[PDB]
Design a protein around this ligand. Structure first.
Ligand code: S0D
Ligand code: S0D
Ligand code: MG
Ligand code: MG
Lengths: 546, 546
């Protein structure tokens, strides 16, 4: 029956409400109870505040009218306003005080997830204050989670006028009894109730959510911790840069502030960063999430040496040059992890800071050919399988859904060891035709990877493994250096390929290295533990990159 | 005969040279003449400094070796280093002191323009200092103007070793007698001279340029003021955002710092900002240069109302939402100019500051239908011609080269009045079939516009003129407001369509409006007077947007 849910902003989605600060301001300054609220509401439907709320005038133009209203109210109550009484002041403070009410937002998210159409209905203003940006951010963060944001000042109508409800119902393509509306002002609820809408008078958040749960039949209060916001590919800004005549790099771009360039592993995609991208943007960073060379919408030339680390690094530097970035923060996972350590060693001037998930920095051994070094560790046997061009490509392309559903598994779900892969003749020889779906990924998400790898297959990606000698000789040039820029190593407890122990000597070469560790986390760190990853990266970014 | 020109960086392309600061530092601190230079050069080919220059170690690792070298030199000269003697200190200061030597760069530009291959050959270091970014910027600005940048620390070789010259000659695909090399250290010139290269010992810049002029046969000294750096379309980062299901916006993106969104006019392109894009990026801004709806690589739906100002503005706001930008600076020219004033009036929270080239802000007249208002000014008669769908499209698409070559003209070059265009039956009825090429644009640049407009023609662009009534009714809602965010109006003396006088009352609605004025400037402001435009915008950005 209920198909839509509408949330007020002041006092419902954002707290403390500003009338809150009119109450407190009167008290703090020992004025008559309600005086400020009388000034605010003066003239009712024709007063200064309605005109503001309807979009007739801007917030800066209203400020001096509210002043005058405050003078008039005070003279008629036979009191004086204090010296330095400042309307702008009180409001700037009130407006920066309000934050998103997290449990209300998550309840709106959940309802949207079970198929509700959701909206924000608010009396608000055209904000031209010097400090307008703070609310612009808050409104951006809230709005991306809802089907509609309806603002009185954009539509020329105000709660409680009945026209804005008819505008609401009509935007919603729904009938009044299909709608629940939460608001903290009972007068606002009155006309919605008249048309037959369910309404909820919002005082404390938890009781409103209890009413909302009872009315929708959906569990909203005490619900488990939700995943971070993910990314829908067709809502993103997609960027393309030609780094040389045969070679373009594609990236997804979100946010503003210091550039943070995310470099995914094998066999992955920009989309492997879906849970980090909105969080890092939201934390004040300009996120650039690559398709690395070989993948997705970046070019995938066939030649093996197009994928040695030297060339891959030179091309990432060209990518910064063409974009006009003197530096970026480089955060890599897996093969992208190895690449960011090499950016730190050969291009420190271009790297604001470097972080890697899972991939340790281990300096090349100049007395042991890397084929040798590899043969001295059973867990890297599968890399020998990867060498012969064509062999791994045929197995991995043969059925894409099976390939990613077999690879993308949480630590208690595995279906392949990387164990005697050569001996066995393949990576999947002893895994199922139709693997079950991991808890980490939906069917849709697997099909995004499938569709990406239909463009170029596994030649480019596999070629990353096919430059052992060439990478070893280049790495050997760097054996005198240390990494002395800000650096973060994050280990994953249950990555059985890139194990935490392999990172144990890194402080010898990176003396001020910082660390995070994630327990109960397999190799696919970003989608295995997105919440913990976000917290470690954002905290390290804020202290070391900013 | 000469086909290539190679410029040193320290003392040639960048000034003051750092050995300069070793001289000054000794004096300032009353140490023995040359002591610092002795420490620097200690051990010659095997000493700490060569290892740095070859890329064996980073700058941070070298600092404490130079210290020790400074201790050893001082004890052997029987003196004491002062208290707080700081190698890091001296170098940070020396490195931030060096700026681009503008006349050398312009000479390199000119030689490149007459077909020389150009390069920078420098002994430099892997810079991992806290402050590394300053040099990263300087190196970025210099490098984009040259075919190659060869750095000792990236190639593992140093001037004056003869191997780096063989590497030079081989990168240049040239023989030693086809090459001139400028350097401020004679030892560096010695081996180039041995292979038969022309060399120039650089002391004062002007004498080196005189030698370089005499040797190349090209005038380099006292040459007229060059145009700002332009953009080559295939070197840019190209960005794409879907703002709604039928509609994507394309943009070119360069730089980092506060977002600056450039909005071109009719019938134009992101490329109309080619001279502003590198300058504004270079000035510390993140430039986003749009193809506006209707143009170039943005979508061009056919319906007229898809181009009313309301919809166009809503979609620019969606563009910010998807890119994750809470605000941008909006700078418009012509129709893009009108649009940015409307962004300031309806979305002040999303606009950091607003500037317009040529387009004044004139509030709608609510007592006069705009068709009327238009008919009351002979200079806007041509807009009536634009109304009837199809008519102007056929004339303007009929021959694209002629269309842009007729439109894109400097003020003393015109071939069309906008005068009795209806009466005459067309915009070009009395202009030539094959117009001469304006001084403002090359043949190539016209052909970029031609190729852009082959994608969608003139329907979308013309539709911007086809919403007079609809724009008037929307604009009327804003008649109570003023524009109170930071705002810049730039008038063009000889724009005979959007004349300076039409802007004269703007202070009534925008009380703190700032102004620029450009004399001897026609309607195509950005390409007519690129140098002056850049200076006015960058100065207004730095004071008001930053
Ligand atoms: C740098 N590096 C990356 C790997 C690796 N092997 C894999 C095998 C399967 C899936 C992901 C994998 N990632 C090893 N070394
Ligand atoms: C907002 N606005 C733009 C114009 C205009 N007319 C033109 C006629 C020709 C070329 C460019 C032109 N630009 C008038 N008003
Ligand atoms: Mg409220
Ligand atoms: Mg020099």
């Amino acid at each position: 029956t209920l198909r839509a849910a509408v949330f007020d902003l002041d006092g419902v989605l954002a707290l403390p409400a500003v009338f809150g600060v009119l109450g407190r301001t009167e008290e703090a300054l020992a004025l008559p109870r309600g005086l400020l609220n009388d000034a605010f509401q003066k003239g009712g439907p024709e007063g200064a505040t309605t005109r503001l709320m309807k979009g007739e005038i801007t917030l800066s133009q209203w400020i001096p009218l509210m002043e005058e209203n405050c003078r008039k109210c005070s003279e008629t109550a036979k009191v004086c306003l204090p010296k330095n009484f400042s309307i702008k002041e009180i409001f700037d403070k009130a407006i920066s005080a309000r934050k998103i009410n997290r449990p209300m937002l998550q309840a709106a998210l959940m309802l949207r997830k079970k198929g509700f159409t959701t909206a924000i209905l608010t009396n608000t203003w055209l904000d031209d204050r010097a400090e307008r940006d703070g609310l612009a951010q808050l409104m951006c963060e809230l709005k991306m989670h809802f089907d509609f944001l309806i603002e009185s000042c954009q539509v020329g109508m105000v709660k409680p006028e009945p026209q804005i409800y008819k505008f609401l119902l009509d935007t919603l393509k729904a009938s009044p009894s299909e709608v629940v509306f939460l608001d903290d002002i009972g007068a606002n609820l009155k006309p919605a109730r008249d048309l037959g809408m369910v309404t909820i008078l919002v005082q404390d958040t938890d009781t409103a959510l209890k009413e909302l749960e009872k009315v929708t039949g959906i569990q909203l209060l005490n619900t488990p911790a939700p995943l971070p916001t993910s990314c829908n590919p067709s809502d993103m800004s997609h960027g393309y840069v030609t780094v040389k005549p045969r070679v373009r790099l594609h990236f997804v771009e979100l946010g503003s502030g210091p550039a943070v360039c995310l470099c995914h592993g094998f066999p992955e995609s920009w989309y492997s960063w879906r849970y980090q991208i909105p969080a890092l943007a939201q934390a004040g960073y300009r996120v650039l999430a690559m398709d690395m060379k070989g993948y997705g919408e970046s070019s995938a030339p066939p030649e093996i040496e197009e994928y040695c680390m030297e060339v891959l690094c030179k091309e990432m530097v060209t990518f910064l040059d063409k974009l006009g970035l003197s530096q970026a923060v480089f955060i890599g996972h897996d093969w992208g992890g190895m690449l960011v350590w090499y950016m730190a060693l050969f291009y420190p001037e271009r790297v604001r800071a470097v972080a890697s998930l899972n991939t340790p920095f281990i300096p090349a051994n100049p007395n042991m050919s890397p084929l040798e070094s590899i043969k001295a560790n059973p867990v890297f046997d599968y890399q020998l399988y990867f060498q012969e061009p064509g062999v791994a490509e045929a197995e991995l392309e043969q059925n894409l859904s099976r390939t990613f559903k077999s690879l993308f598994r949480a630590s208690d779900e595995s279906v392949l060891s990387m164990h005697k892969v050569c001996e066995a003749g393949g990576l999947f020889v002893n895994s199922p035709e139709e693997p079950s779906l991991s808890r980490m990924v939906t069917e849709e998400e697997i099909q995004f990877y499938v569709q990406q790898f239909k463009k170029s297959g596994f030649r480019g990606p596999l070629n990353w493994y096919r430059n052992m000698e060439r990478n070893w000789k280049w790495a050997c040039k760097s054996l005198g250096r240390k990494i002395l820029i800000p650096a973060l190593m994050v280990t994953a407890e249950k990555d059985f390929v890139l194990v935490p122990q392999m990172s144990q000597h890194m402080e010898d070469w990176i003396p001020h290295l910082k660390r995070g560790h994630i327990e109960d986390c397999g190799h696919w760190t970003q989608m295995d533990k997105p919440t913990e990853v976000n917290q470690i990266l954002i905290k390290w970014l804020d202290s070391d990159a900013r």
